[PDB]
C-alpha cells in the first residue's frame, strides 16, 4: 500500500574512499624513493 525511494551511504565499510589504503601507497613511496637514491649512486 506504499512505495519507497532509495538513498546511498558508504563506499566500502570500516575504510573510506578518502583514505582508501592511505598507507599501502605512502610507505611504498618511501621504498621507491630509496630505490631512486640507490640508483643515483649506482649510475654515478
Amino acid at each position: 500500500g506504499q512505495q519507497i525511494f532509495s538513498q546511498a551511504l558508504l563506499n566500502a565499510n570500516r575504510r573510506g574512499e578518502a583514505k582508501t589504503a592511505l598507507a599501502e601507497v605512502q610507505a611504498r613511496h618511501q621504498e621507491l624513493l630509496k630505490l631512486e637514491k640507490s640508483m643515483a649512486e649506482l649510475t654515478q
Binding site: 611504498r28 621504498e31 621507491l32 630509496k34 630505490l35 640507490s38 640508483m39 649512486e41 649506482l42
Partner: peptide, 19 residues
C-alpha cells in the same frame, strides 16, 4: 617483496661498482 628484492640487487651492484 619484488621491490625489496630489486633494492637488494641494486645495493649489491652498487657494492660491485664501488669495488
Amino acid at each position: 617483496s619484488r621491490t625489496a628484492e630489486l633494492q637488494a640487487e641494486i645495493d649489491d651492484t652498487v657494492g660491485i661498482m664501488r669495488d
